Amino acid sequence: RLPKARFIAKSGACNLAHKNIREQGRFLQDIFTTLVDLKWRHTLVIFTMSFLCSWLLFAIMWWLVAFAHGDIYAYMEKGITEKSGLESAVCVTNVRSFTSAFLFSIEVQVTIGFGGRMMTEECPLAITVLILQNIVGLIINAVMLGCIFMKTAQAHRRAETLIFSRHAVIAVRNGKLCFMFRVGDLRKSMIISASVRIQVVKKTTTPEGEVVPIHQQDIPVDNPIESNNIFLVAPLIICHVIDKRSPLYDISATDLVNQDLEVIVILEGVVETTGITTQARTSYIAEEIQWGHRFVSIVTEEEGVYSVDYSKFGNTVRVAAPRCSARELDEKPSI
Amino acid sequence: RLPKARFIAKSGACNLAHKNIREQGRFLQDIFTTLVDLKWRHTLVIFTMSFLCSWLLFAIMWWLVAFAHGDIYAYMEKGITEKSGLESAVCVTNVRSFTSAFLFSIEVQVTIGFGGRMMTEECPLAITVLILQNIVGLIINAVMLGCIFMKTAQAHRRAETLIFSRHAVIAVRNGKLCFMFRVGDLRKSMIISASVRIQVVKKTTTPEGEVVPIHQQDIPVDNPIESNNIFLVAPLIICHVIDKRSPLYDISATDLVNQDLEVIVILEGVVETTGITTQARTSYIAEEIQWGHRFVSIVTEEEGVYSVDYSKFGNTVRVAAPRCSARELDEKPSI
Amino acid sequence: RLPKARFIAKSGACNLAHKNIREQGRFLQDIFTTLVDLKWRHTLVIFTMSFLCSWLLFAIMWWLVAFAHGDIYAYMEKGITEKSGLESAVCVTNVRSFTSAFLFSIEVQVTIGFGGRMMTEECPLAITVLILQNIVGLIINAVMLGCIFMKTAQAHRRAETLIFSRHAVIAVRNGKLCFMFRVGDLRKSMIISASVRIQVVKKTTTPEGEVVPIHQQDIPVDNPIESNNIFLVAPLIICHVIDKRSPLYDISATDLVNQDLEVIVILEGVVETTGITTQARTSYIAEEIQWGHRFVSIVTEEEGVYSVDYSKFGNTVRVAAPRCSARELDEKPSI
Numbered sequence A, B, C: 001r002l003p004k005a006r007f008i009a010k011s012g013a014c015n016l017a018h019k020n021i022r023e024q025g026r027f028l029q030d031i032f033t034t035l036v037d038l039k040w041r042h043t044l045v046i047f048t049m050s051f052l053c054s055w056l057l058f059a060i061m062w063w064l065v066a067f068a069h070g071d072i073y074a075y076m077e078k079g080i081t082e083k084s085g086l087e088s089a090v091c092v093t094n095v096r097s098f099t100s101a102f103l104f105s106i107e108v109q110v111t112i113g114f115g116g117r118m119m120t121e122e123c124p125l126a127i128t129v130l131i132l133q134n135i136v137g138l139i140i141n142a143v144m145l146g147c148i149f150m151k152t153a154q155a156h157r158r159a160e161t162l163i164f165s166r167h168a169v170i171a172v173r174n175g176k177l178c179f180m181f182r183v184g185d186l187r188k189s190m191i192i193s194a195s196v197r198i199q200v201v202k203k204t205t206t207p208e209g210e211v212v213p214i215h216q217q218d219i220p221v222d223n224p225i226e227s228n229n230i231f232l233v234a235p236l237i238i239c240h241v242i243d244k245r246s247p248l249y250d251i252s253a254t255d256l257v258n259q260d261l262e263v264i265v266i267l268e269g270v271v272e273t274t275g276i277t278t279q280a281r282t283s284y285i286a287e288e289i290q291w292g293h294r295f296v297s298i299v300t301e302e303e304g305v306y307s308v309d310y311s312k313f314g315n316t317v318r319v320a321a322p323r324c325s326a327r328e329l330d331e332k333p334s335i
């Protein structure tokens, strides 16, 4: 049938819609913020076109300011007839075409300055254009260096190397029921101050009328000293003991076929080397909760040092377990 | 008359005045910190003016040293005479006017160095000025590039995108009279490790006369596992259960209007993308607190997906609730 | 025989061996990331080689374009003819060899532009090569500055500086057995917001048959207000008191030699100078726990100041202690 309403997909990225938000309006900072955060394949194109366009723009300007003053006419007539007169005190020496203007703009903008096409002092308009081009070039160059430095500072970024298990299992641990899943780390560095949270999403109904459509009740992670902190080195099993205070206290095996259950798992912490905090998410719906399974053991020391066999990360071995809601299991103990 | 003196405006900014603080003065570091943080409308202006003024200043120096050494007179006479006589070993070739001096300064500080106005081995004051100009140009260049790198790093920085409702409410949940409001977000990245702290700012009175005028009293947010943290994707209803420890345990509907209440809401977290901690604040006073109203349900399920209608963000309906102080209901629910 | 497998060695660096991981693809981003994090001995080499290779490559290009055109022939026949028959026909003036091509490439790419080898405006192919060289030089220059900027930024951080004692003790402190070790710091700065966590790695079996290879159990460190936060200026003695739920409850004094134990200590914090969160780890096994000892005092008052004496950091003196398991000292109280 048409897929259900899933609060967050199997890889985070909540499938929500945010409509009717008041339009704050398009800004001029959208362009810049996009420019700073681009892909290399397009950064190295805007970088090239910025130059290749500024050179051309100021080339057109120099070609004009050498057309108006009559410089092209001097270098076209006296260059044939008589070399004397210094070409009648042109604005810029030896600019006599559009290739000349283009090369002069390239020199003044890159700051090569060969010196064959030298700026004279015989017209202030040229001095104006030279000042303009120097300032424009400095600004463009500073901005492009900034972009490349930003791309360099974000070079260690990767995807989320935290992995989960597609199946979450309900089983019996230390006498009671337990909802459990597995989590594992692929990155070489050990995240610092890791933490886990678990939330059941439902549609609650208070006695007095309220109906919160997606109410995210929170669930306590099972742990000896009642904390959230975990030490992720080898893949490990996060558990939750379904007692009289958990919204799964009235969930049985037969009911777990059509059920308004969705368990959100949020794991976050600071990475040791890079130093930027990360958050990973996953979700399980009544399809991926299998009643009466358990996870296999993985670690084993073949010779000396231990070894984690990741080939069986999400495995699940069928086991024998009750078939009644956790409420029954204490309503009729010792059965 | 004047409204009762708030503590933090509903916008979020503090209103207190810090008067009579031993002055430390204004350092020189303020003039640089203010420079690294300017609007582009002014960053570009100072970027232009720094270079323009430096070029003009060192042009003045070059013109002066081309005067004092008797180099302008030699060029003017050689123009008056027939032959230049190698300008008789000038300080700096082909600098015969102020304009030429400006061009030479532009070439020396942008490092264009066309090379028609060279620099000779004659007078060492020229070499001293050249060293000064080189070092000053390098320092100014480095500073401007640093400021532009700062801008390109602060590209992502914006204002607060967190949203608190216009006015809180006080309703009945599970037979308990509790105070609740709504918080939401217009951002895109989930705030990593949010935390919601609530306080009551009220004038206390110790029995031994330790009167405090603005007393900040922490209040505990309702949570099934007793922690502040919240996962914020869709808009949430923050709530506070009024009980024996709650300062609001005496407030009635009719006595609400004439109360010196103020409830301060602080919300902290880390932005996943930009990685910089934030903080939002808001305040409620006895006018905003709507007694007896409760909010409306935003999220709706449709097209097999959830959807949030941000047009109803602040809507609140009136529902029939006890019109008596919390202590009245709690002491004698029916007696 | 072979040393028994460990979990975390005496210097952190978990000694596990993850295998069978579903290996991903190798991306060029890995090459760039390796480039951006390097050792100065290699940063300098890659920096130098980039520029040498680029100068040489474009020297080859310029020499080829001086060969294909009639340039080398013209400048070789001009010397014979003793007349400048090659002033304007040349693709790039005064480039008549490979050494001169190399000099011209250096001038164009470092932006010196001496001007003895000028860029003529005849051959369009040369103009194409010049534009290409300028763009490539700009890109390489920006990349290398970005690498140096990253080096400068992450320059401040250095290696670990937390000192842990070689082996622990099990004393009696305030009428109960306590497992103690000593942690000190050699750094000059302050670990802001430090924290201590203790775990027991051991192979556990459940009544239902779920066997966990290396289970990590959380140990409540002993603090008078039940918190982790430790303030570290003078070396501290971290202690844990063996109560009804500690896994070290039933381990006696005689059979501590052969017992599957391992105590992992993880100490986290935030340094003040650079604000880079750090985590330091260590582990103790059965062979390195000395029953009935206690650490000697280290700090003596010199009547002007206290004076820690780190020479005795790991010293530990033998004292009396009930030579029996922690269960017998309360189930058999008389002892």
Ligand SMILES: CCCCCCCCCCCCCCCCCC(=O)OC[C@H](COP(=O)(O)OC[C@H](N)C(=O)O)OC(=O)CCCCCCCCCCCCCCCCC
Pocket (backbone or CB within 6 Å): A038, A039, A040, A041, A044, A048, C028, C029, C032, C035, C050, C053, C054, C057, C128, C131, C132, C135, C136, C139, C140, C143
């Ligand atoms: C000769 C000796 C020189 C030696 C230099 C060595 C020292 C420098 C270090 C090497 C780096 C050189 C600079 C390039 C840096 C980019 C390389 C690499 O890091 O990027 C990889 C790019 C593609 O990445 P992406 O699409 O953004 O992926 C998103 C992100 N990376 C992610 O996965 O999360 O993939 C690519 O980068 C593909 C590049 C193909 C095309 C390259 C040329 C483009 C520029 C062309 C400009 C010159 C010509 C233009 C004008 C011509 C006019 C005639």
Ligand SMILES: CCCCCCCCCCCCCCCCCC(=O)OC[C@H](COP(=O)(O)OC[C@H](N)C(=O)O)OC(=O)CCCCCCCCCCCCCCCCC
Pocket (backbone or CB within 6 Å): A028, A029, A032, A050, A053, A054, A057, A136, A139, A140, A143, B038, B039, B040, B041, B042, B044, B045, B048, B157
């Ligand atoms: C010749 C080009 C041909 C070839 C094309 C080359 C392409 C160029 C690539 C690199 C561009 C370099 C400049 C980019 C500027 C982007 C900055 C812009 O997006 O910021 C917005 C500015 C004004 O916003 P703000 O509120 O004051 O500050 C932003 C604040 N942080 C905020 O978020 O809210 O909005 C503005 O943009 C300010 C406009 C009004 C400024 C008034 C006059 C400026 C002073 C004098 C001009 C100086 C010369 C400028 C040269 C620019 C050309 C490179």
Ligand SMILES: CCCCCCCCCCCCCCCCCC(=O)OC[C@H](COP(=O)(O)OC[C@H](N)C(=O)O)OC(=O)CCCCCCCCCCCCCCCCC
Pocket (backbone or CB within 6 Å): C038, C039, C040, C041, C042, C044, C045, C048
């Ligand atoms: C007249 C001068 C006045 C101006 C001076 C003022 C300052 C401006 C210049 C600043 C100099 C640059 C700063 C360098 C900082 C020194 C860093 C130093 O640690 O590295 C020197 C190396 C040490 O190697 P390392 O252990 O890997 O270091 C990284 C460290 N482990 C880390 O924490 O990460 O030590 C070694 O172990 C030696 C091994 C080789 C290292 C160098 C190799 C040289 C290669 C090429 C260099 C020559 C360049 C020119 C070549 C031209 C070719 C024609």
Ligand SMILES: Nc1ncnc2c1ncn2[C@@H]1O[C@H](COP(=O)(O)OP(=O)(O)OP(=O)(O)O)[C@@H](O)[C@H]1O
Pocket (backbone or CB within 6 Å): A020, A021, A022, A023, B163, B164, B165, B166, B167, B186, B310, B311, B313, B314, B315
């Ligand atoms: N569609 C929306 N888009 C963006 N922000 C919104 C939207 N709806 C409400 N808000 C935010 O909600 C806050 C107030 O919400 P509420 O609807 O309770 O206010 P109100 O009583 O309607 O008064 P106002 O006229 O300020 O909205 C404001 O700060 C506003 O920024």
Ligand SMILES: Nc1ncnc2c1ncn2[C@@H]1O[C@H](COP(=O)(O)OP(=O)(O)OP(=O)(O)O)[C@@H](O)[C@H]1O
Pocket (backbone or CB within 6 Å): A163, A164, A165, A166, A310, A311, A312, A313, A314, A315, C020, C021, C022, C023
């Ligand atoms: N060897 C591995 N390397 C990296 N990631 C893994 C590996 N094995 C499993 N995973 C991750 O664990 C999850 C397992 O879910 P999946 O849909 O792959 O079930 P599966 O293929 O039956 O698992 P398995 O084959 O490991 O039993 C996937 O998200 C995957 O990313």
Ligand SMILES: Nc1ncnc2c1ncn2[C@@H]1O[C@H](COP(=O)(O)OP(=O)(O)OP(=O)(O)O)[C@@H](O)[C@H]1O
Pocket (backbone or CB within 6 Å): C163, C164, C165, C166, C167, C186, C310, C311, C313, C314, C315
């Ligand atoms: N005075 C000190 N200065 C610097 N580091 C020390 C000092 N004393 C001990 N350490 C560090 O503390 C660690 C634990 O040493 P401990 O005192 O427990 O045994 P030890 O007898 O010092 O062993 P070793 O002789 O190998 O250091 C050692 O690895 C050492 O690096």
Ligand SMILES: [K+]
Pocket (backbone or CB within 6 Å): A153, C153
């Ligand atoms: K940074």
Ligand SMILES: [K+]
Pocket (backbone or CB within 6 Å): A110, A111, A112, B110, B111, B112, C110, C111, C112
């Ligand atoms: K230069």
Ligand SMILES: [K+]
Pocket (backbone or CB within 6 Å): A111, A112, A113, A114, B111, B112, B113, B114, B115, C111, C112, C113, C114
């Ligand atoms: K030059």
